[PDB]
């Protein structure tokens, strides 16, 4: 083999592909087009048996003849007749043959124990640089400073251990489905096998009492009632029917997904129900969503996008900083054994150890602020995407309107008089119409919940009679979608003859009713509700003294009115997004005439703002642009949106920039409306609720789901308040986390730089900063005010000003430099003020640098510098546009106050044996050392309250450029 390139590697992956060449040359090699590293095979079970798991799917492909990839969907072209032939169980000898091809039917999480996980964190070139720094400063004997950068790099690791062991504990909780499952064998058995031995091609008999689900099986025989709350959040009971003979992604009403909980499971044909296993652990629903979490898409928040700028600047400060060290120390007559070490020591102060510890902890407080409010996020780095959102798409029903249809009242008809809509249906007396709305229902009085059609259960408590004077006699015609109506014959004690109640649409039923009974103003009465967003149904009766005699020659009695109201917290939120100039889009799959009358109510289309319906044609002709008379908006449609994206590709960005109401959108069309806005360089958000949004919540940059405790059908922000008032809370938290991450970074840099400058102003005169001084500084002062810096919080009102989004920009480099100038003109303003004192004596220069110098040239530099760090933390931590004022952070004022008081003490009145300061500065020189700290405290607040008020006189996003064109000339004629 001669593969021992390991010996070569001992000497030491930026270029893995390059590295790969070294390792090897029809086995164990796989370049999977993304980092190209997945080497696995098993070759067991007396076959070829390719094995490799690339993200958890098995890919049985070692060749082209007797192998084929994608264990998911390798038997996807089945027929509906074929699964009925699999009603019998697989053979027990053949049952342990399909387990080789498929998985063990367990979506598994590795344990990743503590020796295996500490090695995956410390193996990086930014903890190995500091392990070099442990053995670098410890060449100067028995340092305390070589202990602190071990003790604050054991906080940097242990916080990265905590955010990993708590994220993987969350994913391991939701996929725990330990249950013993009864099946059928090849010939008349049960055998009660474990759920970790189920393969597709097996039967499955459901328990009628209780149990969740083993795996997504097709309901081949029987009736079942499930609870889909684990997979979609729509927690209403869904009735599952038996699969007819003659497509698993199409027949949703015949599949029992893995994770949903089954409730009734009645048989009605035989002794029990039957199912046919289709998928397994990593290739199911709830197995595909978890595999989309633990291998996420890369986030489009390029934090430190420049990637070379900081590194090259680092290079210049380090080198043009370390060649000043080699120029001044060599003019101090050194024996060359330590110049090298002094320079490496100068390079180790420009890399702060607590930089990964303060950027990690800045995100743990962000998840700790959203969990108090309700939003449960799991991907920690997608918090910062909420600060950068120019666009938010909404669903309609359940999201910013009510969940189900709600009744308004009754419009009766007593002799064609058109008596108006009553506000409360509990107020009309009992008759043929009041008995009508309480008995024509396809519900079921089972387990104390009326379960059935969501519409007619709402009119049960609209008046509230008793249920289970009328009695359920017979359902003469079931409510079918083909004939659209439902006839129920009812009787009651005290009747001469039973009546026949039937409900349906207004137009189709009145065309079958008596023409002498339906009036002439029936079309405009239908028109006055179908154009305002009302859903209206009619009802009829006929007394009976079978066939369709129950539905014929009917009297028109009255109208029933249903209407989806807005939520009370919808209107102040849509106005608060329009006021802060982020654009609001509604993406619904409901009717178009309903969607316009809602988008005028909530506030996408404000009054005195025109909108025009496009309504393109299926033919390749023009767009027709119908107007509406009741900025500039456009209202699209479902089949309209397919015409522009196919036949008019040059006119597509002119529509998505100024189109607001998208109606009749298919659930597979909600996902490329998001992927097309991301190609206009929007950063799209998506608040949604249901199964229709499962493709579009993932594709969005911030996908938010409503009204669920802790689920995974979201991208990540499942919240739990059932309103759209959480979508400003993600904007308002993602903005106070995007500049806090900037304020933490531009403080670490400011500290490293003040230290490089105090070790460099002390390398001249050969008076290097002490032992407990480096420790003090770092640990105490710079880690207390960096772990506690990021606890402030979000503001209370959003604003028009976005965060700057780019770290190394022109307002950041300038402040750092000006602040550095104020910092170096005060250490030089403190060093050259002791030198003019009468009590001043110099240092014994020719002894060593760290050995025997408790002198006056470090006492002034350590005192001035300690305060510089505390001043700078407070200066860089501002919260006027985005975060909050810093006095609300009570554990951050107590740091500053306590640390400042200790520091003022060690300069006025000890820690003089320790920290090696000069014994007593005798005269009243102490009182004006606090003088030029005060004009550093004043001179830093009055420097960043001026520099952020700077406008340099001298549309990056694609959409912004288009908007400018629209402003100059409206695109519609």
Numbering used by the authors: 60 to 71, 113 to 125, 140 to 360, 365 to 582, 610 to 613, 620 to 696, 708 to 779, 784 to 796, ...
Give sentences from the paper:
ATP13A2 belongs to the orphan P5B adenosine triphosphatases (ATPase) family and has been established as a lysosomal polyamine exporter to maintain the normal function of lysosomes and mitochondria. Here, using single-particle cryo-EM, we present the structures of full-length human ATP13A2 in three distinct conformations including an E1 state (apo), an E1P-ADP state with ATP and Mg2+, and an E2-Pi state with SPM, phosphatidic acid (PA), and phosphatidylinositol(3,5)bisphosphate [PI(3,5)P2]. The structure of the human ATP13A2 adopts the typical P-type ATPase fold with overall dimensions of 125 Å × 75 Å × 70 Å, including ten transmembrane (TM) helices and three conserved cytoplasmic domains [N (nucleotide-binding) domain; A (actuator) domain; and P (phosphorylation) domain]. In addition, the P5B type ATP13A2 also comprises two specific domains: a C-terminal extension domain (CTD) laying close to the P-domain and an N-terminal domain (NTD) preceding the A domain showing amphipathic feature.
To investigate the conformational change of ATP13A2 during the phosphorylation process, we solved two intermediate state structures, a 3.3 Å resolution E1 state and a 3.0 Å E1P-ADP state. Both of these two maps show well-resolved density. ATP binds to ATP13A2 and the resultant phosphoryl transfer reaction induces the rearrangement of the N domain, by which the N domain tilt around 30° to lay close to the A and P domain, thus sealing the crevice formed by the N and P domain compared to the E1 state. Notably, in our E1 state and E1P-ADP state structures, this cavity is nearly closed which prevents the binding and passage of substrate. The binding of ATP and Mg2+ induces the proximal arrangement of the N domain, by which the N domain tilt around 30° to lay close to the A and P domain, resulting in the E1-to-(E1-ATP) transition. Release of the Pi forms the intermediate E2 state, in which the cavity towards cytosol is open, thus allowing the translocation of SPM to the cytosol side. The A-domain should move back to the original position after the release of SPM to the cytosol, the protein then adopts the E1 conformation, ready to initiate another transport cycle.
